[PDB]
């Protein structure tokens, strides 16, 4: 049988390719590792004829450097030029770039009328992450890059962090060629993982040679895997996105809450425990979780058993292992793979969450600052237990608990349980039409980056 | 199961190094994305042409109701999440029949789809496109909210009045439309479809048979496409 294998290092394979390949050591094309390049032209207030001319000339220089894809084959950079203001509009689509010449003609002739509305740069990020980058070419080493241009300094608001998290979740590495330095934005980008964005400063008039060098070599052209050490990244942007290395003393505390035999067929249960085991494998458990003050701990909890309705003397949940119950990653992984078993009971979601947070998190010694509660729901949640559950969630959100919801199957309603996940629900709430989807890259990457979004 | 397989190295090499010939090994295109509750307004456009027929209209009705059911519809006109659905049927007269505007009123859409009546008359694709643009997007009520992307679904066999095709395509392009046409038949002009698709042939779904709308695989793929 087996769950699955371990992927080899992406950079090692790429290097082994580009030295035994009579198709790579020729000309030095800029958009290596094909990319979808989104250009969010700033058509907001404070942008006049001259400013738009300069911005379009910067875009023209960049696209002149690139090599636009002209076939079904997955290579070259495909350019989508949108213009963003209080609203967002699309001028060039990814599939519209059939040839480089016609794309350049469209960009040069692009004369979108200047607007007189505020700069909703966060709306631009959300739209680019969700809509523009929805349908993109299949590829594991494909890159998603958006070059946002900003002239009016941003403001420190929660929606900015929400949009940054959405960008990170969608797999898109932003790049803000700001005209002026705004501390609020660069602080907002400072949620650092292997897909963290950056903000530059757009100079005046000429002197764009070194500026283009900086904005191309470190961000668009290669940006990865031999990243031109004189970039400042510090090897902080490889493929196969993960969180920061062990050097980051991340004080995470994750508790998973599963479902009973009610709509958790052994197939779905196997998939959920596989996902949990993979998530643990990609974390940093404390060597001694009982007495250590730093590092991480995990717990997995199942929904209520059958003999929990007439009374509440027994735990409303089958606590499979508390936070400080396993001190070694291998032991926990083996327990999840082999020792786990269903229990054939009812759900009672709100009571389960309350008991788990009141007798698994708090009971453990030295609680971590940031703690996460994952709910893996695979069945209908009766409305009578909806409200109470949400009420409990509110309390858990007051004590600092970030929530991840994974609705599995079609039976689970999504209209009501969407709000359970912490804000923004787009990234924290996840949908899977099948259990198998839990073990696919779009969700494994989200799980890996989960410590970053919290 | 290996972490990467023959197809994974296939695409690795085809991506990092280059291509030749283009030969297409394996099948991995347009990864799309498992849909969140992002706001999407889906407009369905049905063929009133004599060729479509009666039981074909019934199968298309079943498909439309099924997709409207499966998707997580919205709850108000200005909803920022979920999705909305509308149906249009272009026939003879310029004032095409509005089966229902963009609605989340699931009972309303079900009863309307039950009460919508086949036209069975000549029609024009461009006429239907312009009528939909001027009767849903430009409609005073139930118009596509700006933050919600618009997706035009074309239940057209392809053989239909072409009058105002390039003009209709330009009008759709202006309104930031993302058409996804369905070709239900074997005698479909690929070129009018390409014009309808606004450039991309991955936005046109070719069907082996009229009842292909009911197959679970096609339903799932299309649902992921629009949502």
């Amino acid at each position: 049988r087996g769950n699955r294998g371990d992927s080899i290092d992406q950079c090692a394979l790429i290097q082994s390719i580009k030295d035994k390949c009579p198709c790579c050591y020729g000309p030095l094309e800029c958009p290596v590792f094909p990319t979808e390049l989104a250009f969010a032209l700033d058509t907001s207030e404070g942008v006049n004829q001259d400013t738009f001319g300069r911005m379009r000339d910067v875009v023209l220089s960049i696209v002149n450097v690139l090599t636009i894809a002209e076939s079904n084959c997955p290579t070259g950079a495909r350019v989508a030029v949108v213009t963003y203001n209080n609203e967002v509009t699309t001028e060039i689509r990814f599939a519209d770039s059939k040839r480089k010449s016609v794309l350049l003609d469209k960009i040069k002739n692009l004369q979108v009328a200047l607007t007189s509305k505020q700069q909703s740069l966060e709306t631009a990020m959300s739209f680019v992450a969700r809509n523009t980058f929805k349908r993109v070419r299949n590829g594991f080493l494909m890159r998603k890059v958006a070059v946002f241009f900003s002239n009016t300094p941003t403001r420190a608001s929660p929606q900015l962090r929400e949009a940054v998290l959405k960008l990170s979740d969608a797999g898109i590495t932003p790049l803000f060629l700001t005209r002026q330095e705004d501390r609020q934005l660069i602080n907002a980008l400072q949620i650092n993982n292997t897909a963290v964005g950056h903000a530059l400063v757009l100079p005046a008039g000429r002197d764009l040679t070194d500026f283009l060098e900086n904005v191309l070599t470190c961000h668009v052209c290669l940006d990865i895997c031999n990243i031109d050490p004189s970039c400042g990244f510090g090897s902080w942007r490889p493929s196969f996105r993960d969180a920061a290395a062990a050097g980051s003393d991340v004080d995470i505390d994750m508790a998973f809450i599963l479902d009973s035999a009610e709509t958790t067929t052994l197939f779905q249960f196997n998939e959920m425990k596989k996902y949990i085991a993979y998530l643990v494998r990609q974390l940093d458990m404390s060597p001694d979780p009982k007495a250590s003050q730093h590092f991480a701990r995990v717990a997995v909890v199942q929904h209520a058993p059958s003999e929990s309705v007439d009374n509440a003397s027994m735990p409303p949940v089958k606590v499979e292992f508390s936070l400080t119950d396993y001190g070694s990653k291998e032991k926990l992984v083996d327990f999840l793979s082999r020792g786990m078993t269903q229990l054939q009971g009812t759900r009672a979601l709100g009571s389960a969450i309350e008991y788990t947070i009141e007798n698994v998190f708090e009971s453990a010694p030295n609680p971590r600052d940031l703690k996460i509660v994952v709910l893996m729901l695979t069945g209908e949640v009766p409305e009578q237990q909806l409200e109470e559950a949400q009420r409990v969630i509110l309390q858990a959100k007051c004590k600092g608990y970030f929530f991840v919801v994974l609705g599995i199957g079609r039976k689970v309603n999504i209209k009501e349980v969407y709000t359970f996940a912490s804000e923004p629900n787009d990234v924290f709430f996840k949908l899977v039409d099948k259990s198998t989807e839990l073990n696919e890259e779009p969700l494994m990457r989200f799980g890996r980056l989960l410590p970053s979004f919290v | 199961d290996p972490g990467l397989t023959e197809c994974d190295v296939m695409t690795y090499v085809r991506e990092t190094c280059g291509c030749c010939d283009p030969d297409l090994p394996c099948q991995t295109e347009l990864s799309v994305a498992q849909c969140t509750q992002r706001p999407v307004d889906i407009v369905f456009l049905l063929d009133g042409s004599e060729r479509l027929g009666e039981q074909n209209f019934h199968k298309a009705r079943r498909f439309v109701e099924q997709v409207a059911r499966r998707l997580t519809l919205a709850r108000r006109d200005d909803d920022p999440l979920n999705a909305r659905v509308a149906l249009l049927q272009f026939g003879g007269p310029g004032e095409q029949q509005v089966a229902f505007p963009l609605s989340h009123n699931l009972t309303a859409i079900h009863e309307a789809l039950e009460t919508t009546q086949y036209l069975n008359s000549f029609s024009h694709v461009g006429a239907g496109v312009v009528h939909a643009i001027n009767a849903i997007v430009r409609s005073p009520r139930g118009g596509a909210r700006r933050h919600a992307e618009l997706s035009f679904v074309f239940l057209t066999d392809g053989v239909t009045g072409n009058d105002s095709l390039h003009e209709s395509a330009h009008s759709m392009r202006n309104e930031n439309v993302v058409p996804t046409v369905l070709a239900l038949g074997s005698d479909v002009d690929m070129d009018v479809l390409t014009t309808l698709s606004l450039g991309d042939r991955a936005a046109v779904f070719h069907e082996k048979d009229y009842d292909s709308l009911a197959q679970p695989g096609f339903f799932d793929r299309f649902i992921r496409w629009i949502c």
């Binding site: 087996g2 | 199961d1 023959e6 085809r14 190094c17």
Partner: peptide, 25 residues
């Protein structure tokens, strides 16, 4: 269950690489 292999290693990866890019310079 067992952790699946690392995929095409050595023989397989080299075979594929010399199979695709056998038509360029």
């Amino acid at each position: 269950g067992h952790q699946g292999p690392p995929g095409p290693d050595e023989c397989e990866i080299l075979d594929i690489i010399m199979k695709m890019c056998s038509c360029c310079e």
